[PDB]
Structure formats: C-alpha cells, structure tokens
Design a protein around this ligand. Structure first.
Ligand SMILES: Cn1cc(-c2ccccc2)nc1/C=C/c1cccc(N2CCOCC2)n1
Ligand SMILES: [Mg+2]
Ligand SMILES: [Zn+2]
Length: 313
C-alpha cells in the first residue's frame, strides 16, 4: 500500500520532460512505467501484483525487432505521461488509466512489417482485418493479455467503467495507424479554426486522443538530436528488411524501404517532418498549449536534417 517506486535523481527530474530517453537498461523500464502510472493516476489505480504481472506479459509479447519492440512501447507511454502531466485537469480518471496502458500495448506482437506488406504477402491477419491490420491485431493481443488469470488490472472498475476503458484503449490503438492520422488531423484543424472544437463532445475527445496517440507514437522526432538520429537507424533497419521481402515477392519496394537508396534518407526524413511530424505537433500545440516543447524539439530536429543535407554533417 505504502510502497512507492523511486528513481535516481537524474531520472526522477528528466522523466518529467518531453525529451527524456528511457536509457539502455531494459530491467529499469518496468519500474519507469509503474512510476509514471503511480504519479499520472495514483498508487490506487491498479493492484501492484496485477500491474507487474500485466507489464511482464506485455513485455513477453513484443518481439526482438529493431524498432517496433518493448523499448518503443515504453518510450511511447512516457510521451503520453508527459502530455497527461502537463494537462492535469483536461483528462478523466479512466482516460489516464486507459491511455498509459494503450501506449504500452499499442504495438503488441509487431513483426516489423507494414499493413501493405501483410496484404501483398497475403498474411492470414490481412483476411481477418482488412484495414488497420496490425492495429486490430495489437488491440486483440491487449484483450488476450487482460484475460489471462491474475492479469485483469481493471477488475475493480464497474461493468460500465470497464467497457468505457476498453473502448478508450481500442480507439487509441486503432488511431496509431498512420493511414488514419491525415484525415483525423485535417478535421481537428477545421474544428480548431472554425471554433467548433468541443472537449465535452465525445467524438471530438476521441479525435484529440487519436492525435495524442500519433504524437506519442512519433515522439522519436522530439528527442535530442543524437537520440533522433540513432533511432532513425532502427526504423530504417525494419523498412529495408521489408523492402528486401517486397523484392522476394517480385515487387520493387518504395524508395523508403529500398536499402540501395540509403543516400536519400536525409530528404525522406525532411518530407516526413514537413508532411507528418510538424503538422501533427502544430495541431496538438494549438489544442493543448502545454505540448509546445514537442513542436519545438521537432523543429530543432528538422533543422538538424537540413544540416545533414547541406553536407554540414
Ligand atoms: C516518408 N519517408 C520517405 C523516406 C525515404 C528514405 C530514403 C529514401 C527514400 C525515401 N523516409 C521517410 C521517413 C520514414 C519514417 C516513417 C515513420 C516514422 C519515421 N520516423 C523516424 C524515426 O523515429 C520515428 C519516426 N520515419
Ligand atoms: Mg503501430
Ligand atoms: Zn508504435
């Protein structure tokens, strides 16, 4: 009951900043997540015995892939922790409970391949889920783990609170499908600008939580340049692997996934910052002003890619 998690001083301070990197010590990641739940939600939100069992089963169902791994799950949950802590009073008790879990679970049993690769390969999951294929799978794996004996961290929610929380987690996980991001942000843009944005409107909250999910999922672009750059190598290691598998099925992959076209990575990151990242954190900053540091860090990293291209690194 009175058993707090405490971190060393540097982590205890830096974990509160948007740009915190959880470090290379894997055995500290579970404790970092519990720390964030206890301050985001309270020491009462979950039974520690059950949360600890849930965390370790979720860890087990992330694979040893270069990018879409247990480290990303925890990184994405920390960005959400930063947003919730900088926006205390905008979020219900159930929302704070659901979103940290949604973030930890959002990429469960990822194999390092896109929805396109599953469809061109004709993977069973592409027949079971025609759109947001991996994301429907990740939500499904979440429900599985929640139903293992001793793993129901929501046991003490009422029947109806329970259904609300699994509904928050479902929409939050589905929204991590970047194919859905573009129109979600366009609608959030029109609503903010025409002044129709209304946080008491459930379908509006849903959109805003969805943009938060894209923001946390993409938060590698909001770290210190050396974290941003080194993470870019991990994400390209998956893409180039998928490119290799595209060629094995007899399909020229897009340049993004073609390891022969590595030269063009700096320009490809530029397009991505301009077309996805900057717009994402811009609309998030307009809706939730305290998330401006994510926009500011993203702009700094855009400038760092501009320098790579100009031969200054
Ligand atoms: C859109 N595009 C095009 C190219 C490219 C590269 C080389 C040759 C030709 C084209 N490359 C990107 C970018 C990919 C990409 C996609 C999703 C996330 C992400 N980041 C980087 C690391 O941390 C989190 C988000 N980057
Ligand atoms: Mg994903
Ligand atoms: Zn992800």
């Amino acid at each position: 009951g009175l058993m707090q998690f405490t971190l060393p001083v540097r982590l205890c301070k830096e974990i509160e900043l948007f740009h915190f990197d959880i470090g290379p010590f894997e055995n500290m990641w579970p404790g970092i997540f519990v720390y964030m739940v206890h301050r985001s939600c309270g020491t009462s939100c979950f039974e520690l015995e059950k949360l600890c069992r849930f965390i370790m089963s979720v860890k087990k169902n992330y694979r040893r892939v270069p990018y879409h791994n247990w480290k990303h799950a925890v990184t994405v949950a920390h960005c959400m922790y930063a947003i919730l802590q900088n926006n205390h009073t905008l979020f219900t008790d159930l929302e704070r409970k659901g979103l940290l879990i949604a973030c930890l679970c959002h990429d469960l049993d990822h194999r390092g391949f896109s929805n396109s690769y599953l469809q061109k390969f004709d993977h069973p999951l592409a027949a079971l889920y025609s759109t947001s294929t991996m994301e429907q799978h990740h939500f499904s794996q979440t429900v599985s783990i929640l139903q293992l004996e001793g793993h129901n961290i929501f046991s003490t929610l009422s029947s109806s609170e329970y259904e609300q929380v699994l509904e928050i987690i479902r929409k939050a996980i589905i929204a991590t499908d970047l194919a859905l991001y573009f129109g979600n942000r366009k609608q959030l843009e029109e609503m903010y600008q025409t002044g129709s944005l209304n946080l008491n409107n459930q379908s509006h909250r849903d959109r805003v939580i969805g943009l938060m999910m894209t923001a946390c999922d993409l938060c590698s672009v909001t770290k210190l340049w050396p974290v941003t750059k080194l993470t870019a190598n991990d994400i390209y290691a998956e893409f180039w692997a998928e490119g290799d598998e595209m060629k094995k099925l007899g399909i020229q992959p897009i340049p993004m996934m073609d390891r022969d076209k590595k030269d063009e990575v700096p320009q490809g990151q530029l397009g991505f910052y301009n077309a996805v990242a900057i717009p994402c954190y811009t609309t998030l900053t307009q809706i939730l002003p305290p998330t401006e540091p994510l926009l500011k860090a993203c702009r700094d990293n855009l400038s760092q890619w501009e320098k790579v291209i100009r031969g200054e690194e």
